[PDB]
Design a protein around this motif. Sequence first.
Motif, PDB file in Angstrom:
ATOM      1  N   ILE A 134      37.346  38.084  44.620  1.00  0.00           N
ATOM      2  CA  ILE A 134      35.993  38.650  44.600  1.00  0.00           C
ATOM      3  C   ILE A 134      35.021  37.744  43.779  1.00  0.00           C
ATOM      4  CG2 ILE A 134      34.662  40.672  43.765  1.00  0.00           C
ATOM      5  CD1 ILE A 134      37.163  42.349  44.495  1.00  0.00           C
ATOM      6  N   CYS A 135      35.474  37.219  42.616  1.00  0.00           N
ATOM      7  CA  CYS A 135      34.654  36.331  41.778  1.00  0.00           C
ATOM      8  C   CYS A 135      34.246  35.091  42.561  1.00  0.00           C
ATOM      9  CB  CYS A 135      35.387  35.920  40.499  1.00  0.00           C
ATOM     10  SG  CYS A 135      36.306  37.241  39.681  1.00  0.00           S
ATOM     11  N   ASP A 136      35.218  34.494  43.255  1.00  0.00           N
ATOM     12  CA  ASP A 136      35.031  33.261  43.995  1.00  0.00           C
ATOM     13  C   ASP A 136      34.130  33.397  45.213  1.00  0.00           C
ATOM     14  OD1 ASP A 136      36.592  31.614  42.309  1.00  0.00           O
ATOM     15  OD2 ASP A 136      38.448  32.142  43.330  1.00  0.00           O
ATOM     16  N   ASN A 137      34.007  34.613  45.783  1.00  0.00           N
ATOM     17  CA  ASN A 137      33.264  34.776  47.026  1.00  0.00           C
ATOM     18  C   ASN A 137      32.091  35.768  47.012  1.00  0.00           C
ATOM     19  OD1 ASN A 137      35.058  32.940  48.622  1.00  0.00           O
ATOM     20  ND2 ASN A 137      36.555  34.455  48.040  1.00  0.00           N
ATOM     21  N   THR A 138      31.680  36.266  45.842  1.00  0.00           N
ATOM     22  CA  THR A 138      30.561  37.210  45.760  1.00  0.00           C
ATOM     23  C   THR A 138      29.634  36.882  44.532  1.00  0.00           C
ATOM     24  OG1 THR A 138      31.724  38.826  44.380  1.00  0.00           O
ATOM     25  CG2 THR A 138      32.078  39.041  46.773  1.00  0.00           C
ATOM     26  N   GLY A 139      28.528  37.613  44.393  1.00  0.00           N
ATOM     27  CA  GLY A 139      27.679  37.497  43.221  1.00  0.00           C
ATOM     28  C   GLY A 139      28.106  38.441  42.106  1.00  0.00           C
ATOM     29  N   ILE A 140      29.302  39.079  42.232  1.00  0.00           N
ATOM     30  CA  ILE A 140      29.838  40.003  41.242  1.00  0.00           C
ATOM     31  C   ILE A 140      30.419  39.204  40.084  1.00  0.00           C
ATOM     32  CG2 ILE A 140      31.430  41.948  40.869  1.00  0.00           C
ATOM     33  CD1 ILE A 140      31.235  42.481  43.904  1.00  0.00           C
ATOM     34  N   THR A 141      29.918  39.460  38.870  1.00  0.00           N
ATOM     35  CA  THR A 141      30.368  38.718  37.699  1.00  0.00           C
ATOM     36  C   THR A 141      31.316  39.521  36.788  1.00  0.00           C
ATOM     37  OG1 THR A 141      28.483  39.183  36.271  1.00  0.00           O
ATOM     38  CG2 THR A 141      28.246  37.352  37.817  1.00  0.00           C
ATOM     39  N   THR A 142      31.472  40.834  37.022  1.00  0.00           N
ATOM     40  CA  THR A 142      32.365  41.687  36.237  1.00  0.00           C
ATOM     41  C   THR A 142      33.284  42.409  37.222  1.00  0.00           C
ATOM     42  OG1 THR A 142      30.856  41.907  34.324  1.00  0.00           O
ATOM     43  CG2 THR A 142      32.355  43.777  34.768  1.00  0.00           C
ATOM     44  N   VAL A 143      34.598  42.122  37.176  1.00  0.00           N
ATOM     45  CA  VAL A 143      35.593  42.682  38.105  1.00  0.00           C
ATOM     46  C   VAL A 143      36.694  43.511  37.402  1.00  0.00           C
ATOM     47  CG1 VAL A 143      35.182  41.020  39.980  1.00  0.00           C
ATOM     48  CG2 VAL A 143      36.753  40.434  38.099  1.00  0.00           C
ATOM     49  N   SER A 144      37.521  44.248  38.186  1.00  0.00           N
ATOM     50  CA  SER A 144      38.616  45.084  37.691  1.00  0.00           C
ATOM     51  C   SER A 144      39.645  44.286  36.885  1.00  0.00           C
ATOM     52  CB  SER A 144      39.350  45.738  38.861  1.00  0.00           C
ATOM     53  OG  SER A 144      38.592  46.731  39.529  1.00  0.00           O
ATOM     54  N   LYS A 145      40.156  44.864  35.794  1.00  0.00           N
ATOM     55  CA  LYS A 145      41.232  44.250  35.030  1.00  0.00           C
ATOM     56  C   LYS A 145      42.496  44.583  35.821  1.00  0.00           C
ATOM     57  N   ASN A 146      43.375  43.601  36.034  1.00  0.00           N
ATOM     58  CA  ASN A 146      44.612  43.805  36.808  1.00  0.00           C
ATOM     59  C   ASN A 146      45.531  44.851  36.149  1.00  0.00           C
ATOM     60  OD1 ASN A 146      44.879  42.039  39.371  1.00  0.00           O
ATOM     61  ND2 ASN A 146      43.968  40.606  37.867  1.00  0.00           N
ATOM     62  N   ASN A 147      46.174  45.773  36.919  1.00  0.00           N
ATOM     63  CA  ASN A 147      46.214  45.887  38.384  1.00  0.00           C
ATOM     64  C   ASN A 147      44.930  46.518  38.932  1.00  0.00           C
ATOM     65  OD1 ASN A 147      47.036  46.742  41.137  1.00  0.00           O
ATOM     66  ND2 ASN A 147      49.136  46.842  40.453  1.00  0.00           N
ATOM     67  N   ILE A 148      44.246  45.834  39.866  1.00  0.00           N
ATOM     68  CA  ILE A 148      42.990  46.288  40.489  1.00  0.00           C
ATOM     69  C   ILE A 148      43.105  47.677  41.164  1.00  0.00           C
ATOM     70  CG2 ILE A 148      43.522  44.774  42.475  1.00  0.00           C
ATOM     71  CD1 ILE A 148      40.418  44.598  42.934  1.00  0.00           C
ATOM     72  N   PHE A 149      44.294  48.001  41.673  1.00  0.00           N
ATOM     73  CA  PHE A 149      44.554  49.278  42.339  1.00  0.00           C
ATOM     74  C   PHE A 149      44.655  50.459  41.353  1.00  0.00           C
ATOM     75  CE2 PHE A 149      46.441  46.046  45.301  1.00  0.00           C
ATOM     76  CZ  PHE A 149      45.343  46.028  46.118  1.00  0.00           C
ATOM     77  N   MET A 150      44.943  50.182  40.066  1.00  0.00           N
ATOM     78  CA  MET A 150      45.039  51.211  39.048  1.00  0.00           C
ATOM     79  C   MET A 150      43.719  51.335  38.256  1.00  0.00           C
ATOM     80  SD  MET A 150      47.937  51.664  36.131  1.00  0.00           S
ATOM     81  CE  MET A 150      49.153  51.830  37.440  1.00  0.00           C
ATOM     82  N   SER A 151      43.082  50.193  37.960  1.00  0.00           N
ATOM     83  CA  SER A 151      41.820  50.154  37.236  1.00  0.00           C
ATOM     84  C   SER A 151      40.735  50.851  38.052  1.00  0.00           C
ATOM     85  CB  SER A 151      41.436  48.705  36.971  1.00  0.00           C
ATOM     86  OG  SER A 151      42.417  48.112  36.137  1.00  0.00           O
ATOM     87  N   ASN A 152      39.973  51.791  37.444  1.00  0.00           N
ATOM     88  CA  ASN A 152      38.948  52.536  38.186  1.00  0.00           C
ATOM     89  C   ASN A 152      37.790  53.080  37.344  1.00  0.00           C
ATOM     90  OD1 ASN A 152      40.319  54.652  36.858  1.00  0.00           O
ATOM     91  ND2 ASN A 152      40.711  55.830  38.698  1.00  0.00           N
TER      92      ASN A 152
END
Lengths: 103, 464
Positions: B424-442
């Motif tokens: 997501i970081c590499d392909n969008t303008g989103i600079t703040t993403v989910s801490k891994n595991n992305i499926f649990m982080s919400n």
Amino acid sequence: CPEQDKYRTITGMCNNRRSPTLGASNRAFVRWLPAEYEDGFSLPYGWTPGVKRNGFPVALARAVSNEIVRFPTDQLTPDQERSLMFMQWGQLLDHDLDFTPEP
Amino acid sequence: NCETSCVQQPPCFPLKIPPNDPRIKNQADCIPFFRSCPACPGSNITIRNQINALTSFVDASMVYGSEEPLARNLRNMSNQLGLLAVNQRFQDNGRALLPFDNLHDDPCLLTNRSARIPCFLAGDTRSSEMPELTSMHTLLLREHNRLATELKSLNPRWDGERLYQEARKIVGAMVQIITYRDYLPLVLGPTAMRKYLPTYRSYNDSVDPRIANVFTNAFRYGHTLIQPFMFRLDNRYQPMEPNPRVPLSRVFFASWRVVLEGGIDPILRGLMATPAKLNRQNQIAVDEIRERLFEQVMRIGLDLPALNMQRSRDHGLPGYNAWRRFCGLPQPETVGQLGTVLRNLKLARKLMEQYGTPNNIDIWMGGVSEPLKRKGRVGPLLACIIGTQFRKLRDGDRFWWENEGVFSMQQRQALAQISLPRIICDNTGITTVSKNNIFMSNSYPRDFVNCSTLPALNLASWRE
Ligand SMILES: *[C@@H]1O[C@H](CO[C@@H]2O[C@@H](C)[C@@H](O)[C@@H](O)[C@@H]2O)[C@@H](O[C@@H]2O[C@H](CO)[C@@H](O[C@@H]3O[C@H](CO[C@H]4O[C@H](CO)[C@@H](O)[C@H](O)[C@@H]4O)[C@@H](O)[C@H](O[C@H]4O[C@H](CO)[C@@H](O)[C@H](O)[C@@H]4O)[C@@H]3O)[C@H](O)[C@H]2NC(C)=O)[C@H](O)[C@H]1NC(C)=O
Ligand code: HEC
Ligand SMILES: *[C@@H]1O[C@H](CO)[C@@H](O)[C@H](O)[C@H]1NC(C)=O
Ligand SMILES: *[C@@H]1O[C@H](CO)[C@@H](O)[C@H](O)[C@H]1NC(C)=O
Ligand SMILES: [Ca+2]
Ligand SMILES: [Cl-]
Ligand SMILES: [Cl-]
């Protein structure tokens, strides 16, 4: 079927070398249990009025959905340990595995 | 025609309407349904089976396609850069969007007449079903083009076909890694994960990698996770007003929402920072799919859970107890027995009232009714069918990323560092993403990290 290869084929054909269509596209699904049809080979359960399945009437899918599945939306329980990304990855992944065509 | 008639004549298998229905008051009406294409049309010898139109392998076929003419059309054939084709009329803040499809009857055009935005073209035909899926297809399209650009600078002598194939192989490996490392452990839970998916040894050519007929229905458990709205969040993860929560009945086939309502970035933010719907025995599936599925483009709103049950019958799937037997699980014969299996007698009673016997409970219905496994989102039966299927796809895949000869020791070491938040970081303008595991982080900002903190995929071992 090539003896040496570096990449996958687009159709998936030739992944298994002894049976080169296994996992390939536009092929019948494998079955883990024999199918159960109203006539043994094609008609689905619920097709014929009054034809019971295993001694019991076939419930309407809409009736099952109404009595068992239906619930008030305002009651929804958010999952404290799962994100909507968990839902979305599952749909995206399912679209890498199977698509059952319709007429 | 199954779309407009209620007559039960092949290939139509319409769902009849029960008396005292909460929505469909006309009992002469029905929910439309076409029987799945038979593998052997009109046969009086073969036991009817259905067709898989995709490659069963976890190979990113939803990006590349499962048929050669489609796969060719999805590529940018204008140059020797090995990229995938992108939308020519529109961009998402300078970023790429999927190309448009050339359908004769386009359902996306019906979602907003004014907008005139048709369906997107992707490896799989369902790319425009919900804008959250479109966002994931768009994210993976950008990752391929990003990889082929990075690889072209590393290996200038490589041609279009080499660049396409090398970038395709990496994308497919990432789908396998996110699925088996991050997704599946959270679906099955840890004990089922160890039972059905033990540590990978090597490829075994006697493992049938085909998708089983039952898996097409059992994997629909994901319908119990669906939220009634599409959530869109702005730069600071605050509701993107107006319309930060749009009902699902208003987003089905709404490709215009991606082109005109802000692109893929607010959709991805919403998916990461919104919790999933939790499956509970008295809160199985929401009415956006149970009553208003594809409501905007059809003559009547469909019922997704009911379509699943009619689909299992169309597919001739055995009921609950036969699948519990197949998995080596006890098979309840009564409401008393079934109450013990479900740890819930009130649900066992409701199920027995509809079905009469646990032998007849439709596989999706029985499966989504079982209590969830510890740290998992499915019960014992679905854990078995799902678990069994994914082991066959891993151990029966000659191009499995860990199989010797697919990648080099160093390339595997490099691929282990990937993650969905990084993609997501590499392909969008989103600079703040989910801490891994992305499926649990919400939860924002508790479960969130900065894009700079996450490490990128190092392509150094790909140089010649
Ligand atoms: C490569 O994978 C092969 C497939 O393995 C399966 O799938 C993978 C993904 C895993 O989940 C794995 O657990 C699965 O087994 C694997 O080959 C398989 O190996 C087993 C064990 O040798 C074979 O089972 C034996 O089958 C015979 C024949 O009967 C079978 O088929 C009929 C008809 O479908 C059924 O009705 C039966 O129930 C059987 O399933 C049996 O006679 C035999 O059991 C008897 O013998 C053993 C001791 O030898 C006793 O313990 C029993 O009690 C019985 O007395 C086994 O059940 C299996 O058929 C075979 N499958 C294939 C497709 O060849 C292979 O070993 C893996 N290779 C490597 C190197 O890992
Ligand atoms: C992780 C699981 C999962 C999720 C999440 C999911 N589905 Fe399903 N869905 C499936 C699978 C698997 C099938 C069967 C696919 C096939 O082979 O045709 C399916 C089939 C369908 C069908 C065909 C129904 C029929 O029997 O005619 C519809 C419609 C559908 N899903 C819509 C959706 C929509 C809309 C969403 C949410 C945006 C969604 N699904 C999310 C797994 C899921
Ligand atoms: C092909 O690549 C060039 C260069 O990146 C780009 O400008 C053009 O729009 C692409 N065409 C398609 C159909 O993607
Ligand atoms: C349709 O799209 C236009 C933008 O072109 C928007 O102004 C309008 O509100 C949308 N209509 C509906 C019904 O969503
Ligand atoms: Ca595939
Ligand atoms: Cl099966
Ligand atoms: Cl275009």
